[PDB]
Amino acid sequence: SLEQLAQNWPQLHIPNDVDYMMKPRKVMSRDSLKHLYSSIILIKNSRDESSSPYEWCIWQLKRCFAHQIETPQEVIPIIISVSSMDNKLSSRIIQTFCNLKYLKLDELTLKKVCGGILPLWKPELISGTREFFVKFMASIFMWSTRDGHDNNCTFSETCFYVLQMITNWVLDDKLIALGLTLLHDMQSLLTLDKIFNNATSNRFSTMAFISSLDILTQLSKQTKSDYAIQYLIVGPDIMNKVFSSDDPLLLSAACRYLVATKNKLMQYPSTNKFVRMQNQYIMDLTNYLYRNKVLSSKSLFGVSPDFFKQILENLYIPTADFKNAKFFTITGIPALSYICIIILRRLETAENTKIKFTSGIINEETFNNFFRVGWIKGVNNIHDLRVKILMHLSNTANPYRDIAAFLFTYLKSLSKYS
Amino acid sequence: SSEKQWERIQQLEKEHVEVYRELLITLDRLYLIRKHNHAVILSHTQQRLLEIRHQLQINLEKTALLIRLLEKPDNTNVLFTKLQNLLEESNSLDYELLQSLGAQSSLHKQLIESRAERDELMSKLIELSSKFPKPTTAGKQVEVEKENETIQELMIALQIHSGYTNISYTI
């Protein structure tokens, strides 16, 4: 009985039958006690490596990996509950089993134990542990390829599993820079062509970018964690790709991080090359849409004035009259074009005139074609229509206000539109 | 009917898009070992920039070969409504994707403070446990208890045998 247990608690001695505690009327049943029995040992003995139940968790975990147990998932929920606490002994659950050798034995069992412990775990080691985990992210790489896929979505989970650990790493005052250094390393691995590209858009890589960028924006809006001045951004070559790849979610957190990066920029001197290069990274993205100077710009995230000849010559483009600009503008970017369309009939409701556009892309000729196939009077050009699209896009109608708000932030010419 | 045709369309799309990708890679390889003098495995700083260029070329191809049959529909041939449907599904799924990311971040925070509060609770309970002492006619009383057990057992038995109408719990 529970009440009878309280009286003899100062004089109660515990024999060591571990799993009999763990393995699941006139007098109260035993089942109610065993829930308290686990907490009893946690309070009878202080958290240390010498605790028998803690060693039992390690031993039973190894049984599942080697398939010695009758069924692998019998003790997995029990291990999860016990290993939630004991930061000093939660690391050895991860540190011992984060090696890629255990992954080869069973990749499925490692996933369910990795995802349930990393968010809880706290940074302890000052050094030795970023590289060990970075090896693990490098371990999954050329391992899914060994499995057969360039990026099998065990990596997507493990990228996020260690990403929430970074949230614990950065929220805690100690080793806040350790999470950022790992964050730049993990993002640098995800930007490469082998894992992701425009043609083969397995954008788990880019979603780990923004989920990393969201933490960067959450840390920023205030200067608690400061990135290196020679580095300030994730990387000069790292997230200029994320602007070229027109993923709507990828452009949002990046521009939010660009605002976060800019919020650190004026503190640093303007004569720095990286400051100027990062400045070049905020204009060109804002140039890249709705400026009609992209083809005239000497730098497109590091790109000279070309691309206009060949594919356009293989099959002639039936458009003209600033045909380059609509290849660049936000209403002309194929992924961002329909987001403007979603804004367009929201703007149409705002303007109280409803009419369906011909296509999901908005440009010069299509708007003229949409005109020639019922709408507000006073505007007939695409320049002002894109303005009325962008200001409503600057309202919290879609999560991609971040692109519209960043465009109106720079430059001062675009500031008056907002 | 048309769904099988579309599936084969996307299969050959994957195949020829990827062959286009490695043709671009090996074709700039035909350039880059000749363009400067002999480089092939330099770091991902301009080969990174080469993939940024590749992405820009592909997206320009999209916005060029997209202002097309899409702009002037054939009203019966499905080349452009499929791409539209892909647009709406991606855009609609991304919103809930982002809010799921936010909810996950909030849950991670909540777990952090839960661990903190559990930590100070464990510290206080350890202090309380340390405050307590460590775990470790009597024979006549034991004999009396044994006698009571025997007497109650025998009374219960005999009352059941005789069919007594007032059999009760005896301690």
């Binding site: 590289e131 970075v134 490098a138 790489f141 050329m142 390829t145 250094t181 730049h184 390393d185 640098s188 691995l189 490469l192 082998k194 894992i195 290196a228 580095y231 990387g235 790292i238 | 495995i41 770091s43 991902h44 990174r48």
Partner: peptide, 15 residues
């Protein structure tokens, strides 16, 4: 920090 990024890039090159 950048050394780890370069190491990862080289590893991806080898893969």
């Amino acid at each position: 920090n950048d050394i780890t990024q370069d190491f990862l890039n080289l590893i991806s090159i080898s893969s």
